[PDB]
Symmetry: C3
């Protein structure tokens, strides 16, 4: 179990909402899984009205990519902070033990890189996020978080120990954004990242987000960018919120099996309408589609979903099943 004498393997990370290829149950024994992530500070457009955010990301996306390993593996991360950035960064992995989650061993100034190794000895979906001393909330709310999924080597199980399997996995990061507004009643635009700080902390202190989005922007997962699946497929929906609570719900569907605290050694709950993801954590739900059509996947504080942005869509192909639901009488004049 010395880590230095185990096999090493390299994973190529992909952008949300996809998750990189991986095996659910594995026969292999423990390995050292190597990942690389580059920090990118950039100004991004977060709504359809042209509102901008001075953002900070892991690999250029919000959320950062999901990293997948099995319980007992060692995560070996190379964190790269290019010289074109302006701030220092680091990473705090909630799935790791010690040193402020690794934050103490990964302080990197623009133009520096560092490599950390930690044992992933606890299964579940865990948040990771940047956490620079004295500036923690700002880097997290500007976009620096993602998920680490540690699968049990034997794959997911139901409460009676029966095997659960998914066909497809999607990762949704939910971000509460605090964009300052000026007297016009218009959101401010900033020339540089550093210039947005002072105003942004004042909005943060009110505890009221201006926008709450899935994966980086209002409408990121709606319409043309909907998630896709087919009747009969089992999807795993990973949902992370590194700062604020959320309450995910699939309209027209359910959470067949849900780990809302996100830790796979505990028995999941079944048949949930709406589940709860505590700020600072990631959770996961399984659902097998039974009806075709468009579904909405959203935070069920409906002001947060429809007014502030926390809603996405899943487009499902297949044949309607009239036993589950059937219009007996279409809308028509009442009888007189």
């Amino acid at each position: 179990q010395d880590a230095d004498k185990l096999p090493h393997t390299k994973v190529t990370l992909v952008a949300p909402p996809q998750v990189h290829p991986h095996e659910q149950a594995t026969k292999s024994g423990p390995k050292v899984v190597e990942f690389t992530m580059t920090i990118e500070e950039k100004k991004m457009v977060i709504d359809d009205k042209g509102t901008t955010l001075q953002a900070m990301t892991f690999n250029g996306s919000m959320p950062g990519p999901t990293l997948v390993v099995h319980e007992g593996d060692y995560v070996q991360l190379t964190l790269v902070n290019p010289a074109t950035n302006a701030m220092p960064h680091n990473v705090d992995f909630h799935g790791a033990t010690g040193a402020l989650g690794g934050a103490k061993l990964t302080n990197v100034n623009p133009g520096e890189q560092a490599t950390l190794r930690f044992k992933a000895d606890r299964s579940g979906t865990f948040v990771y996020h940047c956490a620079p001393e004295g500036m923690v909330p700002w880097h997290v709310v500007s976009g620096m978080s993602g998920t680490l999924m540690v699968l049990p080597r034997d794959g997911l199980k139901d409460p009676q120990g029966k095997p659960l399997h998914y066909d497809r996995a999607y990762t949704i990061g939910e971000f509460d954004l605090y964009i300052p507004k000026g007297p016009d009643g218009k959101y401010k635009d900033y020339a540089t990242l550093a210039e947005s700080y002072g105003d942004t902390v004042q909005v943060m202190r009110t505890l009221t987000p201006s926008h709450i989005v899935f994966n980086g922007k209002v409408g990121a997962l709606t319409g043309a960018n909907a998630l896709t699946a087919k009747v009969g497929e089992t999807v795993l929906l990973i949902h992370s919120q590194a700062n604020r609570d959320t309450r995910p719900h699939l309209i027209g569907g359910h959470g067949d099996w849900v780990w809302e605290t996100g830790k796979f050694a505990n028995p999941p709950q079944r048949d949930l309408e709406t589940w709860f993801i505590r700020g600072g954590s990631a959770g996961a739900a399984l659902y097998t589609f039974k009806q075709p059509g468009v579904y909405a996947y959203l935070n069920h504080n409906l002001i947060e979903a429809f007014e502030l942005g926390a809603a996405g869509h899943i487009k499902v192909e297949g044949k309607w099943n009239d036993d589950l639901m059937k219009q007996i009488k279409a809308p028509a004049p009442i009888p007189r």
Copy 2:
């Protein structure tokens, strides 16, 4: 299990906080249970100071009535939108599968009605609410939600599979209201429903309710309108919140058995002081009264309960039991 060849039965719905008569465990096999609900848009008085709300309700009450069926039954709902209303409505049942919870098949303009059938294949208390495309939050926060309770055909069970039974069931809907205030520091009064929209969405976006009430108004379940029970009775308290989290607690009592996510195939938790109902869901608690006296049942954010309105009372008859609690020394001068 074709639904069209099953027996059909009609249920007469009653107003909250009562729940219509039903059997807990049943010997009968699956049926098609027919319900009818009429939408009523009306201006209502929501506090003791004369504040009004331009409300929207299912059957004239907030919340709408609780509908009860057994797992495996088919719900057959006729939704009626009279010509005296002004808006279009529909219904989204969280206990249903497909078509945005039924919302896609029940779009009814004033003067129209529609009938939907869906299989209630998952046990638990589920929210239902109106959800018209582009106006979802407004119809929900104006009062359109209630609960569907799907009991397991064998009745409720504890974690070891031992039977649980209740003598009486009560249904509480908890509503976060967003009533606009003008410069006077007085709540606005609107001539029509449509006129309240613009101002109401501005209050909604602040995420801060002006009032949070049980069943339609401050004091709906207090004093003279308290709930009632007797020492030795087991009550089932159903609590729904279609938009915002809440944390119910009975002062002087406990949740003997609680399904806070509301789904009866999962084991309940025992001895809770305070439980958590996620916005967009309904949950249920069982309690057997052991002491007489007045109890308060409230959201335990005590500002939300005592300042904003989310508190009610339960008046219990019976004999005091000095073993459970006893005043040893009444209040008196300290000794000098």
Copy 3:
């Protein structure tokens, strides 16, 4: 089980964050455990900038002391309200049955005392707080709450019934404070408790705390006042929030076994990154330290922790373990 014929014993309460000596599993049968608490109304400094609060406390601290008994014991509390106070007080124990948690039997004006006895028949960590008719929220948010821990007579157990034991127990109370600000943008200072009321209720109604602190002040458990432990020790962290939700997390660690609803007859959850304490309740987590260094224990709404005050530290002695985490490459220039 008559209480008057059982043995009586007196406990000497200590200030948070310590907890008074007690046995986990006990051979003794039920007893009447006598406690005394004195109310102290005082002006306290709650931050490092000199902000004051007109506070109200049980025994001069926030939170009040933790009282520990075993399931089946009888709690016998003498509540003392000295003549130097200005307000009436009482106590509501969530672990008690009847009479509004005991509040009805303990109304004490300045210069009076009362003694209440109640049977602690349900195991778990329970909140207790003051609750005077018509002034409930104000006494609770000004500081009057603490925890009652009722241990199972056989000690704590894991989900398979295997014994769990802790070496050390710490109690953290988390307080959402509502301190009024005047036009200067400076917090108001009040000559008397009664004078702070009117302004304080106006801030309360916005639902936005000015400060959220652990044990009475920003920095109460940081730096020099950190909690302490050693690698190999198992700590029990009791966390109470009598009014508002919170989401505790240990940076660099986990919740090995957590009862987030706080009731020990239910199976705990394992490997949590972040857990959830519902406003109006207390919960408990166990953790065995595996790495030395400084840990932060905080509410993982990172604005509430770092901007508003809800963060503390745990300083752990011992030897680093390179298998769990190891810096492979310290921060250095990227390669060119």
